[PDB]
Structures are given as C-alpha cells and as structure tokens.
Symmetry: C3
Subunit: 465 residues, 3 copies
C-alpha cells in the first residue's frame, strides 16, 4: 500500500458535504476538518472552538449511513486527547475576551482550526480503516449556529456578525492505495427537562452505557457576570468573578455613593473597619483615602430569597484590603478573603432577578451590568462551568424489569477515569435499558437550585461491517 493526505473542499447548504470516490483510494481513516475563522472587527471564542461548531457528523455509502455521531459525543470521545483539543483552537489569541473600542478596530485576527473527527476506523490504523468497495463515501458535517461558539457582551453587534459569518470548511483524511469487522455506533437519549429518568429501547448488543447531566438555560438570557477566558482553572473562574464584584463592593466616595438601585444597602465602614451583615463580619481597610471621602461597603450586591433565608454574595467576603489611587480615582485592591466558589461564577444573571426572588436581586452599578457576557457553549455538563459539582446522588440501571446495576457514590465514574486514564470521566457501565437517578439537594434559597437539568444516556451498539 501507499498512504496519502487528501484534502477536499465540499458543498455548503449550515451543512457541508464531501464526496470521496477514486479508483486508487482503496481505504481511508483519520478525518480532520479545517475551519477558517474570519477577522472580527467592531465595538471571544469558546475553548475548543472547532469541536463546539460541530452539531453532527455522518459517514454514508450508497447503502446508507455507515457511522454517525452527535457533536458533543465526538468531543467527549476526544476530551482525553490534549493534541486534538489544542488543534480545535485553545489559545489566548482565540479564547481571551478581546475588546473593540472603535467600529474599525480588530477584535480577533483571522485563524485556522483543525478538528480531528475520531472514528472507529482509527483504532488499529490500517487494520480498522474504512475500505471503499468501489463505493462513493459521503461525509456530511452539520454545524451549530455561530452564537454557540462565541462569548460576547451587549455592546457587540451580534446581529450583523451572525448575518455576515460563514463556515469555511475543508475535509482531510489519510487515503490508502492498496475480512468482515465490527464497529460500535454511539446512540444518545436526552431525558425530559428535570426528569430523573431516560430509556434506551432496542438494546440487543451494547458495549457500554454512559450517564451524565447537562444544564438547560432556556429559562435565562444566557448572561453571566464573568468569564476567565483562556485561563480555565476553577481558581481562574473564581478570581475573574471576585474581580468583577470588587469595584461595586467597596466604594471610596465623598458622601453616600450614587448610581446604585434604591434597593442597594451601601453602609459607611466604621473606624473599626468591621461591617456586620447579620451574622457575617466584613473587615474593610483602604489606604490613602482622601480627607473629603469615606469607605463604603455594598452589603447586598447580589441577593436571593424565596422574611426567610438570604443568599447574599456580599456576606461571602470576610476581609478586603487595598489602596486608593488619587491619579486614577480607583481603589487598587490587595488581599481579599472570601468564600466564593465555582457555583457562584456559574449562576446566570437571570436567576438573581427571577420571579421566585422576593428581592430586586442584582444591585450592581449599570457599568458592571453592561460588562456581563453571553455564554452559549453547547457542551456544558453538570450545573457549573467546570462540571465540578456531582448532582447525582444515586443511579439505577434496569435491563428490562431487572436491576442490572445500582450505586450511590460515583464508583462507575472512578472506574471509567482509572481504566481510560481520563480526568474527565462519566458514570459508565462497560460490558431495553432504563436509567433512574436521584438528584442531590442544593438549598431552595440558592439561585443554582433553579438551573434546569437534563439527563443524558449514551449507548454504544455493536454492528457488523
């Protein structure tokens, strides 16, 4: 045999179609989709932008579909491949939130991303390769709306960007100029919103079953206070959020601070430095405060309650130190002691100002609210951005009416992670199927309780080729 890297352009309908047929292409594998990202001008991309574009991939012959996959499941299959993820687009250039100051300003420079479309034909290189029995093979890529792969504020003219944006793809593969086999086709079932059950029918020969949760943000405008950009650690998310709150939390002003809702409770800090918000004490000490000015603490920046308990973000701070700058008229914060977590950074702004909330909700300045970001990432899992919180308390799997498997702790996720050497595993059973979960309880007084959930069940069926 002789291998060759072959690249094809395709027809755009957003859906891209690529036709493979050549007297010398006997076999093929290792599909890679290229995407040309445009120059973005005017007044950031999600991490792994290339994978997030993909809605669905289908491989077909004259006899029909040979193999197909949902975009999220392809991404899940490549999540433990750092190289493939880097090629997708993961950089400060693509993923940091850039700002356009003038209508002619360049926000993002043009770039190319590469999406490794992992197929069952790559497992054993030439041995597993797709053979083309003088057949025409069609590769069909369905794209997600560009709204899903972009993080932006209200100021950005998304309407025009959406109208003008076009997917520019190219398909590459390793062709080979040169026995029956088996292939596993992933099948996905999504449960009804908040329903802790899902069923996979016609299970006759399954190699594995995976169970996970996705948040549903349909009851929101998909706006979040902060986003850390390229820096994706749990701490980066928390630091970006604390940073966004600080300029409204501690104010150096000549008289009571203006520009805040009437619902805002901004209190002058005593000589002591301690402000008491019920049971919580906040120690605030700012250096170089001008003589005509005082230090103020916003005691209800974000507040939620269903006369009952109050989830107050201002109460999550215990110490705030800094120095006022006479030159820039800002407080330059130094050390901050808080108890902010990954869940707080994952609360949509809509849930703070929801109908269930008896309070205003959001007592930030208009300047802070204008800086909020629309995040529509299509592959979010759990109830937080890092999928850190495990919300499944118990899992039961039934084969027919009999209990096939049951667990409390995620011991099936621990084994998945150990056996596949992955740090991003799911509750998986490796070998009809009915899945029932018991969700963990977060307070009814926590805004996160109101994030909608969807149960996802993935089944891999065995097929003869």
């Amino acid at each position: 045999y002789m291998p060759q890297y072959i690249s094809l352009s395709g027809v755009m309908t957003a859906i891209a179609s690529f036709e493979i047929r050549d007297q010398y292409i006997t076999a093929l594998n290792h599909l890679v989709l290229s995407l040309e990202l445009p120059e973005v001008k005017g007044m950031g991309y999600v991490p792994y932008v290339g994978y997030k574009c993909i809605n669905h991939v289908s491989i077909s012959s004259c006899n029909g579909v040979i193999w197909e996959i949902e975009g999220e499941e392809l991404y899940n299959n490549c999540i433990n491949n750092t190289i493939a993820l880097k090629h997708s687009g993961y950089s400060s250039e693509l993923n940091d939130i850039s700002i356009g100051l003038t209508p002619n300003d360049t926000i993002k420079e043009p770039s190319t991303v590469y999406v490794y479309i992992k197929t069952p034909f790559d497992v054993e290189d030439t041995f597993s390769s797709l053979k083309l029995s003088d057949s025409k093979i069609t590769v069909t890529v369905t794209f997600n709306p560009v709204s899903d792969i972009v993080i932006r504020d209200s100021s950005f003219d998304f309407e025009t960007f959406n109208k003008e944006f076009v997917y520019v793809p190219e398909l590459s593969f390793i062709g080979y100029m040169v026995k029956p086999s088996f292939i596993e086709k992933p099948r996905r079932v999504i449960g009804q919103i908040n329903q802790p059950t899902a069923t996979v029918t016609e299970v006759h020969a399954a190699t594995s079953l995976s169970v996970y949760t996705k948040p549903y943000y349909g009851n929101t405008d998909n706006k979040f206070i902060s986003y850390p950009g390229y820096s994706q650690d749990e701490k980066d998310y928390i630091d970006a959020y604390v940073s966004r709150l600080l300029d409204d939390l501690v104010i150096v002003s000549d008289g009571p601070p203006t520009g805040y809702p009437e619902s805002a409770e901004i209190v002058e800090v005593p000589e002591d430095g301690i402000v008491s918000i019920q049971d919580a004490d906040v120690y605030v000490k700012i250096d170089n405060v001008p003589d005509n000015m005082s230090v103020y603490l916003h005691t209800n920046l974000l507040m939620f309650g269903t006369n009952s308990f109050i989830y107050n973000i201002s109460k999550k701070f215990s110490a705030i130190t800094g120095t006022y700058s006479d030159a820039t008229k800002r407080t330059i914060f130094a050390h901050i002691s808080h108890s902010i977590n990954i869940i707080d950074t994952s609360i949509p702004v809509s849930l703070w100002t929801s109908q269930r909330n008896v309070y205003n909700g959001d007592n930030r300045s208009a300047e802070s609210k204008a800086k909020d970001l629309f995040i529509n990432d299509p592959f979010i899992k759990g109830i937080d951005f890092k999928n850190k919180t495990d919300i499944i308390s118990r899992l039961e799997v039934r084969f027919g009416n009999d209990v096939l498997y049951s667990e409390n702790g995620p011991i099936s996720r621990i084994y998945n992670e150990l056996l596949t050497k992955s740090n991003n595993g799911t509750r998986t059973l490796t070998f009809k199927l009915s899945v029932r979960v018991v969700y963990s309880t977060m307070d009814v007084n926590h805004p996160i309780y109101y994030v909608q959930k969807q149960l996802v069940v993935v089944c891999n069926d065995l097929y003869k080729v």
Copy 2:
C-alpha cells in the same frame, strides 16, 4: 464472561476485613478502597490523604497470604498514576490549611476519597486476574493513626479529634463471572537509624531491588514553621516559608521592637538602607513609614552553631522592599531577594532549638511560633519535603560476598526514571543481597545535618501461583 463492579462494607477491629466469596464471582481484580472523611469543626489533610491512611494491605485465602504490601510501597507503585493520586484526595478543599475561628466553625466539609489498591492481578486485565477456586478471599486493610494524615497547629484540639475520628471504609473490585502463573511480592527491609547498610536474606529469585532513604523525626516534636498546602512545588514551599519569616524580619516600630526574646538582635536600618550582618549586606527600604517610627531588621531570626560558624536565616536575605500600611498597621512587602532553599523549609523547629545549638535558636515572636504546624506524613523520602536533595554519594550491592553492582552518581535512578517514564524514581536494579551506601556531607553547622536517616531496601521476589 461478564464483569461487575462489586462493593463490600467490612468489619472494623484500626483494621478493616472484607470477605469475598460467591458462586458466580469466578475471578477478580482492580481493588478500590473508599473512605468517608468527616466534617471537621472547631478552633488540613496531607496530599494523597487516601494512600497515607494505609499502613498495610493483605490478600488471603484458606491456604494463607496470596499477596501483601506495606502502605508506602503501594503508594510508590501508584506514584506515576496521576488519576489514582487525584482520587486519593489532592485538592485545595482537602489540602489547604483551613482555619477555625469559633468552636462551632466548619474547618473541613465532609468528603469521599478513593484508593486504587494496585495489585499484580491488574497488569494484563482478565489474563492476570485473581481466580477464586471456590475459595474465600479475605482483604485486610490496616490503617495508620489519623495523626499521620493531618497537618495542624497547637490551637487545634487534636486530642478530641483523635478520640472521635473513625475510619469508614468500603471495598470495591471488578468481579468476573466466567493456567499456572507468576506474581512478584514486594519485600521491604529498613536499616537501623543512621546505619548506611541493610541486608535482604533468602534472595533466590528477585525481579528487582530498590534503594531509598527516609528521614526519622523521632528526635523532634514534628513541628515545622510553614507548609504550602495544595500548592506543592519547590517554589510554593520556599514562598510559604519566606512569607512566614517576613513579619518578624522587618519591623516598623516607634522605638526598639518589643515582644522578642532578649537573645534577638533587632537593629535600626540606616538612612543608607544597608544593614551588615558580618559578611552579609541586607538592603531594606520601606515606603510610607510614619514620622514617629523607624525600620528595624531582625539580624538573627533563626540561628544555629555547634565562637564558630553560624547558620543564620536573616543572612539569607539581600533585599527587602515594601510599603507600610497606616490602615492595618502592617508592612505590605513587595520584592524580596533571598537565597532560601527547600532544605530551609524542611528543618523541624526542634533542630533550631536543639542541645547541639550554643545559641537560643529561634528568636521569632510568640505570634509566629504559635502558627507552627505538626506534619507527620508517613511517606516522606530524603531529608527535604520534595526529596530534591540526593544524599547517597555511592551505592554498593553485594550478592553473597561478590560485588553485584556499584555506582557513585544515581545512574540507576536515571535508568529507573527513563525506563518507567517516571519523574519520581529510586536507585533501582532491574533483573542474600547486601546494600552499603556512602552518605554525602552537609555541614555539621547546618541544622539539617541532625535529621536522622533510615536506609530502605525493597526486594521483589518471584512466586508461582
């Protein structure tokens, strides 16, 4: 066959026993121990807390022990498995040193850790699995005292914590409902304190020999000035230590600083900014110093000598810059130029104030001394927390009376690390055995010279199954 994840509770005696016997469990492998950590309340856990709990693991049948291992050797076998180590417990939640301010305050939230008990039955999955010849298999886990897995200060009521703490384990394994083999059983020999020799008797069929050193802290109270928490890099250890010394090293005071031992030599910094401690010059410059106050340098914060040479921590600083805060009455340090290393951060406080020391030793404030931490981690290697310093100068291995192997440089550690793709290797010979080492010399005037050492020799014997 058909695999199944089976979980068992066990009997507590601290020793946990788990009995495996089922007409359908034909074979098993991949043992995982779960541990429920309690809520810690009142006025941090070691990294890889789950592995550090284990004292010994034994697998037995009616015919006796099939396989057994010392806790440290199990940990050593899993040290290159990042996933297994993460599952053990390695997070900011578990490993950062948290503070309890009131008797009802929550220091640590409850959590579950998972310990992968790597056995010779996992190497080739089903091919290497332990077969149960209608036999009852007993798994016995011996636990370390909780004192070993916890990092705390004097203020923490350890007495009550120890009395109330209980190990809550559960054993999981992959069971299989379905020829003679060979297995390697690790055997460990620990030399006499400071003795540079150790012998393994009855060596007939060994697959490998490993040699390493452990510090012995019996001549101390196991108290250290600092600990970096979850951040475990060499730099994190050094930064945590420098940070702890700084508030006693440079003092902004109205008149000579009070609250220090009479042995303390606190000198006013000249207009020049340079203080000379013998041959060492320390440049100290603090901004916003009040008119009624002066800048002072502690010239003997920690001092050790056996009229001879002096190991002085204050002499390890060349430049200290900062700004005094009128609001908090503290110096907010900016840039620090020092020559502090990993060894300095690994010196037990006991060795500064030892009988060999002709000086007081420890001239820190009572506030600083109260913040010291008890560290009893059972798996420490070398003479520093990172096992960075190689203290073996030469190694000789004898098979009977003949020299089997000898080396100066750790070329056997370099090969171990290259061949096993590990960054945490030991001097290893891969294939009676007498090991003799020559230890490197650190100054007799260095407190670290007085850290006791133990030679550890691990031998893997071949057994027929």
Copy 3:
C-alpha cells in the same frame, strides 16, 4: 541473558571517544551520556543544556559507521520525552540568569546532566538491541563550543570562561550478557541562506521526510534585550521583555530626563494622562509623584523604518499605571496594557540599529543596553524563540520531476502532531526528493523581516543490518 548498567570514561581530543568490547557484552542499547558542569565564579545555561552540547554522535565498528546523528536531530527525536529533557538539565538552578557581584562570587554551583542518546536499538528493547559480533564498537561524541549552551551579558568574562571550560563526559549503556534487521539512519540537508529550496539526492528507500526552518543570526552579534530563564512560556518571554522596557518607557524626573540619546523623544505626560504618538494614545498615570517632579513618556524607545511607516515599540503600549517610591527612587509599575508579542522578544538588538534603519534605532539608556544578553542556542527553529510563527505558506515535494505532495496549510504538521502525540511537530511526510517552499510575508518595515532563514530537510533512509 543478564543485563548490566556499564559506564565508561573515554578519551578527549572537543571530541570524546568510547570503546566497547568485552567477551561477556553480547548486546547493548540505551546510551546515556553524563556531563559534569563546573562551578561558575565571577562578575545562565540554555534549557536542555545536555542536548545543546552535542554537535554529532557516531556509532562505529571495524566495518565503519553503523549509525550516526546530528545533535539537533537527536534533540528533535527526544523533544516529546519530558523525562529525557529534564535529565538534560531543565531547572531554575541551571536555566535562570544568575548574577555575580564580585570576582569571587559563585554564579552557578557545579552539577551533573544526563543525555539520553536515543538510538534505533531502543525501540523494541532486547529485540532491537545492537549485537556485538566479537566486534569493537566505538562511540564518538563531538561537542558544540560552550558559547552555544551559555546565556550571558557583556560584563561576564566569557574569554576566560571559554579558555578554562572543559567537557567532562562519561558514557553509560545497558549491556546484555547473552536474525537480520533494518534500521533508519537520519540524513539532513540545509538549504542556502534565504533559499526556499533544498534537495536530498540518492533517495531509494526512505521511511519519512521532515521539513522545517531555522533562523540564521550571522548578520547580528546574537544579543537580545531580554530572556525569561527557566520560565519558558510565550507569556514569560513577553513579560520579561515588557519588564526590561518599562524603566526607560515611563520616567519620573525633575526636569527633562537625562542619560538618553539626542534621538530620544521624551515627552511630559499631560494632566489628562494621555500622550499621543501619531495614531496611538498611551494613558500614563503614576501615584505619589514628588511635587518637584513630572511624569515623562519615552515616545520612541525602539524605532524602525526603511518618511515612511514606523515600527515603534512605544506605540505598542496603551495603559501604564504605577506608584513612585520615594525610598528607592523608582516607579513600581502595577497594571500594563500593551500589544507586545513573541516576535518582539525575538528581535536581535542588531536589527534595531541595522543599516536598513533610517532611525538611530535604539534609544534606551546605557544601563538598559548593558543588561542585554548573548543567546547562541544551536537548536532554534522558525523566526521566534517559541517557534510559534509559521512562516511556510506553501510546501511542494518532488520525487524526480513529478509532484509527490503539495500543501498550503501545515496539514502535514497537524498529522505529525496527532500521530506521534507531540505538541512540537514539523511538516512531515510518512511513508531524489526536491523541496520548495513559499515563505509568508511579514512587513518590510518590521525588524523581523531581516532575520535570515535556512530551509532544513530531514530524510530517513532504510538500511539492512
């Protein structure tokens, strides 16, 4: 068989020769070269110092060369082996730029580095090992001048260091006391300076072809403004550079700042804080400025042009905030907003002050210019230190007169990286050969346009053993 780690000293001629012959050494593999680095005294090493020493390695028998490799190609073959690279020497101890203040001061402590000499005899351990047919095997290591592995300033007495420095090597290997095979011998061709073509003649049986670019710094003194040391990320390089410029960029002075060339345009910052450099606005605001002093902005710190466009480093800054220190008489910079990139940090100082430049070029203080570093790393790729910029726009490969392969985008680099699980791949064709590239265009007004390029083509030929 029985394996043994054998170490040999060798003869120094710089060229080291090692002779292997023993009645009991039947086979061998896994060559490791040890190097003793000396104590460096007076008034930093390149990362992977051990690999950068090697110019060439040759393995010979009585019948001639068995296998040989160029130092850069050995390094390229080991670039995806983190362990081997660490052993080479990659630490803060070796790679941070240390300073000697007195002629008796220790800049670097002595150390040992280990260079894994990867050979085709290591692929399948004993199966691929080199068999010694009662033959004498000679290993010849040719070393690079020490000038290549050292990063230093003008103050360092390199002349004396070079005269006194000696390579102290030792060769280790795994010997074994105990059918025809095939081995791939790498062959490298370097094109003429700036020539976008290269040819490999006598190609009869090649397993692969790799193509990459190297900068040629012969038209320079090999001096760069900054180097980040051990911290090697793109951001570390950028931060080190910004940091070096800042003290000349914003000056707090009593009257117009002195000590700058007459070509320097240092402007007083208005009360507004905004300085306009043509189309670019720089916001500069410094706190605690003494009453007798003003804030100045260097508006042409580094300037390049061929009455035309100007590449001005001062125009790459949009916001500079800080606080003046009365104690140290320095500005302590806080937040900086700039558009500095990896290319700016990779510009040799010679290109700023080149004949093509109609401007002075370099309007920094003498203090800043004295801090410049000589970097002679022999394995640099592309036109920047991180090899981030892809300067090949199109690649064409011809086998005879026929086009074997052609590409625009680096799809052959993407496949190399995916198939070899490497994040440091090259445009590679895996299976006479003529390579032609089209280089991308950077502005003629950019100093980087004048960095000389060399096309490198690597061919692996099949040999029978």
